[PDB]
Amino acid sequence: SAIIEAIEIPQFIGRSYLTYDNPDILKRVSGSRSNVFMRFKTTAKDGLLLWRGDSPMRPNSDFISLGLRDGALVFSYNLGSGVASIMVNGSFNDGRWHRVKAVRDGQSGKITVDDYGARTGKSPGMMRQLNINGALYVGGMKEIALHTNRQYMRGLVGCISHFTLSTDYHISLVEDAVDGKNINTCGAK
Ligand SMILES: *[C@@H]1O[C@H](CO)[C@@H](O)[C@H](O)[C@H]1NC(C)=O
């Protein structure tokens, strides 16, 4: 027989998310340095890919975020003195896989999608450190509008195949999550 075995790729339907509270994971979403890699695909123009902020979310709370806006990828973060928002202008909601690398050291941030030209930006003020107490969310989150200060209204509609932090620290999306909502295999349903 031709039965294949493989590692599940999670699918998100807008009200879906995976949550991580593993200290070994959260410790890499904190401090002055951040390195996020993701491979994803979607047909929806908007959607949250990654988020970690404060709970309860306050107006000037720290956060780091990755998401889609009208097909464009937006890397955003607040370190305590203002938000950086760095966009790679594209139409990545074409239902094909795209890889995004988002890198930050202190205030300075950089995001590269596929082989398109990288875009850079900088958080204002003097704050250089991510000081966040919430769990790490992928593909969406519970009460997304409240917890992101209305920066995102829906989670991802699509799939996420790869998620790496610190260039080298692979996250097993399904197995490493402490919880999930409305998650199924990519392509099923
Ligand atoms: C992004 O691309 C669109 C084309 O779809 C263009 O109209 C728009 O001006 C671009 N944005 C920037 C900031 O160049």
From Swiss-Prot:
O-glycosylated; contains chondroitin sulfate and heparan sulfate. It is found in: Secreted, Extracellular space, Extracellular matrix; Synaptic cleft; Presynaptic active zone. Residues 7-181 form the Laminin G-like domain. Involved in both the retinal photoreceptor ribbon synapse formation and physiological functions of visual perception. Plays a key role in the synaptic organization of photoreceptors by mediating transsynaptic interaction between alpha-dystroglycan and GPR179 on the postsynaptic membrane. Necessary for proper bipolar dendritic tip apposition to the photoreceptor ribbon synapse. Promotes matrix assembly and cell adhesiveness. Interacts with DAG1 alpha-dystroglycan. Interacts with GPR158 and GPR179; transsynaptic interaction is required for synaptic organization of photoreceptor cells. This is Pikachurin. The gene is EGFLAM.
